[PDB]
């Protein structure tokens, strides 16, 4: 037979699964069901501080839209 290596393979897939879901789900939990807003250039950065400072709770992820302005 040959499939006796499959359970050795399968446990690895479980181990490598943890980083993929964790760093994704932790992103969802730390962004409130969203993803971490990437900032590869200055614009993507001061955009966050614009959103972080307006939220009032000093969190960029929470966003206030049309219900905020009049």
């Amino acid at each position: 037979m040959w499939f006796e290596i499959l359970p050795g393979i399968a446990v690895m897939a479980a181990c490598l699964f943890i980083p993929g879901m964790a760093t994704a789900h932790i992103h969802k939990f730390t962004n409130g069901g969203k993803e971490k807003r990437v900032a590869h250039f200055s614009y993507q950065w001061n955009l966050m501080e614009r959103d972080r400072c307006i939220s009032g709770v000093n969190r960029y992820h929470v966003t206030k839209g049309l219900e905020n302005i009049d």
């Binding site: 050795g8 690895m12 181990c15 943890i18 980083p19 879901m21 760093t23 994704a24």
Partner: protein, 318 residues
Amino acid sequence: MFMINILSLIIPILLAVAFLTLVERKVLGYMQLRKGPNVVGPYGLLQPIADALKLVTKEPLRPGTSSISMFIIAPILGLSLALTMWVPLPMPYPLINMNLGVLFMLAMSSLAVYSILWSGWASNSKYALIGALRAVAQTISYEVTLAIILLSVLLMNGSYTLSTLITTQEHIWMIFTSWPLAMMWFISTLAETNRAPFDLTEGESELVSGFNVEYAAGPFAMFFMAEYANIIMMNAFTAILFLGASHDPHTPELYTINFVLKTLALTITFLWIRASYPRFRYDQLMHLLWKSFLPLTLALCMWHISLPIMTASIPPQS
């Protein structure tokens, strides 16, 4: 918050490294017509635990000719490097989104050779010293092709951001565009990772153990695990580079399944490739590298820089 993600990344990486010893002795055997570790643990699920436990309970020998200061920094310098190298890997959304991640991965890859260099000096034996001397010279000679292959590949991709890899490689695998460089890249991975036909040091009889000639259980855990640790990732780096998957923002599960399967399959080929080829002699390594691999890589970099200019296909860095 952040720290719980750190253990959630490195810890499963470390536990996977211990298990890779099992398949190294098992899938080789199932190709060698052997059985592989089966008696201990159900289907050999517990052999890596047995392997790792004596290495952390056997006597740690410090030869009198070995500088204890150098004897301890090197295994830490190796294992830690492998773990921190994982932080920019683009697992759906990478833990570290370094816009220069490609350079970041390559930079500390060069830092790896200090692990063998210092160990060869720390061991301080005639045969041991030359074994490391003509081991480091191999790894450095393979980094120049490593950089050139990288430089050509992301030239068509865009910037050096490792997250951009999944964006450029949207519809077609990048291998279909740089397959002459893919095998150029793959063999380069086979040499930096110190595996046959470039096992060389860790060769069970090439250099008996090379970097582990006098270096036995105890601190040797952080010097025979690190090489296997780079194996899973440098193949995974190839998986991101040429075999990129799809990532749905509403379901990152698909890309986790696809990438892990792709990198696990590549590691099978990596374990496949040890059990099918002899070991290159030292002169043959440089002859293959400088005089056949090095010129071809330069020509392909010639081609891959003009082609976006040829077809107005320059990629957006932002």
